[PDB]
Amino acid sequence: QRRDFIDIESKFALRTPEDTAEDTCHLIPGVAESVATCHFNHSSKTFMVIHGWTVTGMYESWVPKLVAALYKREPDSNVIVVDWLSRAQEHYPVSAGYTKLVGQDVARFINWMEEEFNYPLDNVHLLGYSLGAHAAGIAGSLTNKKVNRITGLDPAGPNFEYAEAPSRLSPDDADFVDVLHTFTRGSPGRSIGIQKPVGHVDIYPNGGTFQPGCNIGVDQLVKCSHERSIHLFIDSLLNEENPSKAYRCSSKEAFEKGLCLSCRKNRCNNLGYEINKVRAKRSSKMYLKTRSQMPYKVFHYQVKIHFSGTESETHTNQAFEISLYGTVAESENIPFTLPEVSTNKTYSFLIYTEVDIGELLMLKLKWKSDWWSSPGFAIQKIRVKAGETQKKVIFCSREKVSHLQKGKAPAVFVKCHDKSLN
Amino acid sequence: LRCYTCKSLPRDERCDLTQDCSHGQTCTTLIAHGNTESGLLTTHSTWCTDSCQPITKTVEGTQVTMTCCQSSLCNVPPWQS
Numbered sequence A: 001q002r003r004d005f006i007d008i009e010s011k012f013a014l015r016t017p018e019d020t021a022e023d024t025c026h027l028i029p030g031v032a033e034s035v036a037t038c039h040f041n042h043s044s045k046t047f048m049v050i051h052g053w054t055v056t057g058m059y060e061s062w063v064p065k066l067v068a069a070l071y072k073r074e075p076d077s078n079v080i081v082v083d084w085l086s087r088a089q090e091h092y093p094v095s096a097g098y099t100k101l102v103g104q105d106v107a108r109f110i111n112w113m114e115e116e117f118n119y120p121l122d123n124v125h126l127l128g129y130s131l132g133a134h135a136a137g138i139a140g141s142l143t144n145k146k147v148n149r150i151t152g153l154d155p156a157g158p159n160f161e162y163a164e165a166p167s168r169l170s171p172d173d174a175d176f177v178d179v180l181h182t183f184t185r186g187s188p189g190r191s192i193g194i195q196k197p198v199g200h201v202d203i204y205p206n207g208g209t210f211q212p213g214c215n216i217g218v219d220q221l222v223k224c225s226h227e228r229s230i231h232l233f234i235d236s237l238l239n240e241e242n243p244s245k246a247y248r249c250s251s252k253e254a255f256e257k258g259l260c261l262s263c264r265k266n267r268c269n270n271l272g273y274e275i276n277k278v279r280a281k282r283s284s285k286m287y288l289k290t291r292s293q294m295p296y297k298v299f300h301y302q303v304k305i306h307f308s309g310t311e312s313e314t315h316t317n318q319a320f321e322i323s324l325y326g327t328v329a330e331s332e333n334i335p336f337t338l339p340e341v342s343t344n345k346t347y348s349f350l351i352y353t354e355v356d357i358g359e360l361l362m363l364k365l366k367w368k369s370d371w372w373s374s375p376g377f378a379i380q381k382i383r384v385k386a387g388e389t390q391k392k393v394i395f396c397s398r399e400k401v402s403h404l405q406k407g408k409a410p411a412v413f414v415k416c417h418d419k420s421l422n
Numbered sequence B: 001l002r003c004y005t006c007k008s009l010p011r012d013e014r015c016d017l018t019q020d021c022s023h024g025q026t027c028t029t030l031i032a033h034g035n036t037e038s039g040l041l042t043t044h045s046t047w048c049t050d051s052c053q054p055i056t057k058t059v060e061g062t063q064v065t066m067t068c069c070q071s072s073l074c075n076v077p078p079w080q081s
């Protein structure tokens, strides 16, 4: 049958857990014997890794890392690496046009596997990076039956931002499309990563514009925010027990105020491999904060403070520190500044931490910095909502009220109530 | 189950408040003992919690004691009953 697939330029290398770095064995379309030579296990699910644009025409160092993580997590699976390197080492708008041909080559290969060995497409998960997410989506749209999953790892933005659904990744391309947006910084059509939601679940770590640990200090520096999507996904493969929670929110601004930390009917989901495959009418744009390094997981808290005073005082751009103490551990001197701090007014805000403090017990609050007497607010209670545990916690002052004075001693609050939200 | 549901009461104040708990809920008592800008103070908080786990931890010079309970109106500090 080799004659029927001779026009295909993309190569399909079936890597193994012991040999993750090289394209040793190829699954050649039309040659059923190659599938047996490469020892493809017909009883296992298939992960097809699709790379992006490569200025050097060779594999970026993340490829052996993802393949290694996918075999660690799923040891009996088949990790196929799709090679479209010559088409990927061209002027960007040329390479971006080639995703339609690579998509066609991927779909024809998936269809040949279905036809030749009755392999189910419901056992196929496509993982496309940058241009590869678009080619994964194009492929998904050309299969005889829908593929089970497509994971878009920061799909490319220029030429795709205003592209119609057939020309890019869309939710229609697979039964479930999950996207990680990590380099949306720039104006629409001029952002490295796609801005617009293109899946069923579109996750935007740290707002999605840029990633932590990526400010200055082959073109590794210019691409770490883009490439963080793969490492965020690798981390989810390596920590099945402790997934990173994403939260559905109206905007990245409302999520920064701690307004979106709910888990009620898929308002929260797992980032990565352990995602709950929930399809919705409109796409749920989701948010979360992360660390700068692997393990990326953080704990999100909304903090609400009512500031009570005698006289009508207003203070702008005020710096504070919050210390959280739990049964497991503690996380001290967490800074946050408030734009306005007024008398008899309440303020909400998001606080996050890499530390698993456990169940909260104590909260310490410091107001950071004579011609004038130091300003102050009387605080009775602090309400905290914990996103990961889904617990509404109340802290109340040790005495009747805890006096919060600028540059002075911190206010101490202890837990006085707990409620589970589920 | 019926637990006492009171927020940060002074040591020598009795909880006159109650709440009929949900399923799988137990009575908890949180006692905080330590120095304040009003002298060494003992407080007690009580509520229906979904999963209670006993603990005693000294956090920044404040002894925090959590205890757990399965019988009605049993979340009473040791110095009261």
Ligand SMILES: *[C@@H]1O[C@H](CO)[C@@H](O)[C@H](O)[C@H]1NC(C)=O
Pocket (backbone or CB within 6 Å): A041, A042, A043, A044, A045, A076
């Ligand atoms: C093939 O995969 C199945 C699980 O899908 C596993 O039980 C079996 O051991 C694998 N076969 C080989 C040759 O390892």
Ligand SMILES: *[C@@H]1O[C@H](CO)[C@@H](O)[C@H](O)[C@H]1NC(C)=O
Pocket (backbone or CB within 6 Å): A308, A309, A310, A311, A312, A313, A343, A344
């Ligand atoms: C703040 O509210 C309290 C009553 O809760 C009142 O005594 C105080 O005067 C108020 N301060 C101002 C400036 O409104």
Ligand SMILES: [Ca+2]
Pocket (backbone or CB within 6 Å): A137, A138, A141, A165, A166, A167, A168, A169, A170, A172, A173
């Ligand atoms: Ca599409």
